[PDB]
Design an enzyme around this catalytic site. Structure first.
Site, PDB file in Angstrom:
ATOM      1  N   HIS A  41      -6.864  -3.019 -10.356  1.00  0.00           N
ATOM      2  CA  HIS A  41      -5.472  -3.482 -11.632  1.00  0.00           C
ATOM      3  C   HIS A  41      -6.173  -4.285 -12.023  1.00  0.00           C
ATOM      4  O   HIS A  41      -6.222  -5.312 -12.522  1.00  0.00           O
ATOM      5  CB  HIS A  41      -4.000  -4.215 -10.335  1.00  0.00           C
ATOM      6  CG  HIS A  41      -3.609  -2.776  -9.856  1.00  0.00           C
ATOM      7  ND1 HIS A  41      -3.917  -2.610  -8.300  1.00  0.00           N
ATOM      8  CD2 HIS A  41      -2.609  -2.370 -10.118  1.00  0.00           C
ATOM      9  CE1 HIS A  41      -2.543  -1.644  -8.682  1.00  0.00           C
ATOM     10  NE2 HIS A  41      -2.101  -1.255  -9.486  1.00  0.00           N
ATOM     11  N   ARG A  60       1.195  -1.594  -0.212  1.00  0.00           N
ATOM     12  CA  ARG A  60      -0.389   0.152   0.099  1.00  0.00           C
ATOM     13  C   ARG A  60       0.407   1.013   0.302  1.00  0.00           C
ATOM     14  O   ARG A  60       1.544   1.131   1.055  1.00  0.00           O
ATOM     15  CB  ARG A  60      -1.024   0.220   1.242  1.00  0.00           C
ATOM     16  CG  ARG A  60      -1.649  -1.150   1.434  1.00  0.00           C
ATOM     17  CD  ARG A  60      -2.669  -0.863   0.779  1.00  0.00           C
ATOM     18  NE  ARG A  60      -3.786   0.194   0.145  1.00  0.00           N
ATOM     19  CZ  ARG A  60      -4.106   0.115  -0.884  1.00  0.00           C
ATOM     20  NH1 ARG A  60      -4.350  -0.925  -2.366  1.00  0.00           N
ATOM     21  NH2 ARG A  60      -5.263   0.845  -1.370  1.00  0.00           N
ATOM     22  N   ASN A 103     -14.117  -4.892  -9.484  1.00  0.00           N
ATOM     23  CA  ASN A 103     -12.320  -5.399  -8.492  1.00  0.00           C
ATOM     24  C   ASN A 103     -12.256  -6.973  -8.280  1.00  0.00           C
ATOM     25  O   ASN A 103     -11.741  -7.513  -9.038  1.00  0.00           O
ATOM     26  CB  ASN A 103     -12.355  -4.079  -7.285  1.00  0.00           C
ATOM     27  CG  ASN A 103     -10.604  -4.205  -7.366  1.00  0.00           C
ATOM     28  OD1 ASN A 103     -10.111  -5.307  -7.541  1.00  0.00           O
ATOM     29  ND2 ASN A 103     -10.155  -2.926  -6.409  1.00  0.00           N
ATOM     30  N   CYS A 111       2.429  -1.812  -9.424  1.00  0.00           N
ATOM     31  CA  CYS A 111       1.991  -1.225 -10.929  1.00  0.00           C
ATOM     32  C   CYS A 111       1.384   0.103 -10.674  1.00  0.00           C
ATOM     33  O   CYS A 111       0.005  -0.190 -10.164  1.00  0.00           O
ATOM     34  CB  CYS A 111       1.603  -2.055 -12.092  1.00  0.00           C
ATOM     35  SG  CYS A 111       0.715  -0.935 -13.441  1.00  0.00           S
TER      36      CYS A 111
END
Ligand code: NA
Ligand code: NA
Ligand SMILES: [Zn+2]
Ligand SMILES: [Zn+2]
Ligand SMILES: [Zn+2]
Ligand SMILES: [Zn+2]
Lengths: 162, 162
Positions: B97, B60, B118, B104
């Site tokens: 993501h 994080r 998600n 990334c």
DNA sequence: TTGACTCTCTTAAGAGAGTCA
DNA sequence: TTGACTCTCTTAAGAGAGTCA
């Protein structure tokens, strides 16, 4: 330790009690535009729930039996699987609702698999829509579909390539 | 910060900094037996990470800027979406993501959607295997497949039907 | 031995905020 | 002002264990 016969007796008493829960007929998507029917055996919303059952959370229950003066307790959906391995690939096995109906305790609606496998069924296209689960889904997952994405991939400048 | 101009300036500074992260090529399953290539812009494993960035957990990070003498801070992947609604259907919008690569920060690999949308991409068959996400997946989800179920649905007696 | 409550914990996709230098 | 750390929280699929009568 509880013997095999003792564990089978626990499973049998659990089945006897759950079989008397209200049986609710639900029409469900199977994938491929087809509709099917599932019959869920639903634990009551409030006490009493049934012999041996008690609520430990908003949608969590436990089954308890006292054998030779020792109290034994299990998660309410884990009982069908007490004679099975409890882990696989280094991951804990969890009770997984093929019917996606938490209150249901029908053992024909449960399987025993890692938490990741369990969660993933929420997005499965279903047994008539392309399910590849080796233990096949009973219905299309409730979260299958195009989604509701608010914003897609984007950049303001030219610093990035995909 | 409050102004649209200030927000655009935050987005532009974030893009410039992330644009200098190392670009790592990842070859990925697309579904349908096909493979593709993604270029991830990966935040460093250890400090320093880049101007404005700091690690708040194992995977994080947060981005921070001082505007009008006040520190403003955001989750490191949320910055591209600061001009978008922060909720949808009463569910919090999350940075998602498409490349399934936490480090990334390429905004061409991110979308903005509910946590359920998600998560579900982890099991998607991919853009060449049947993805139905309206904002299309870039790859097959890492958890797609038959699973490793230990035990399927079963009963010992005759009290249940599917 | 049993019922009906109480509490906190796990996982892996995600978050917010404070302490120092 | 900027950097490098610290802590706990959210969600929705799942768990174990204590108290009292
Ligand atoms: Na499930
Ligand atoms: Na994700
Ligand atoms: Zn059911
Ligand atoms: Zn399936
Ligand atoms: Zn990426
Ligand atoms: Zn997809």
């Amino acid at each position: 330790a509880l013997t095999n016969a003792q564990i089978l007796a626990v499973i049998d008493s659990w089945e006897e009690t759950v079989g008397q829960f209200p049986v609710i007929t639900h029409h469900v998507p199977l994938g491929g535009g087809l509709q099917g029917t599932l019959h869920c055996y639903e634990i009551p919303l409030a006490a009493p729930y049934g012999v041996g059952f008690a609520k430990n959370g908003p949608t969590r229950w436990q089954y308890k039996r006292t054998i030779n003066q020792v109290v034994h307790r299990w998660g309410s959906h884990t009982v069908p699987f007490l004679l099975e391995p409890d882990n696989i690939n280094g991951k804990t096995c969890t009770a997984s609702h093929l019917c996606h109906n938490t209150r249901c305790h029908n053992p024909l609606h449960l399987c025993w698999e890692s938490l990741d496998d369990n969660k993933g069924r929420n997005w499965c296209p279903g047994p008539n829509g392309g399910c590849v689960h080796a233990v096949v889904c009973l219905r299309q997952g409730p979260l299958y579909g195009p989604g509701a994405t608010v914003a897609g991939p984007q950049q303001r400048g030219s610093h990035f390539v995909v």
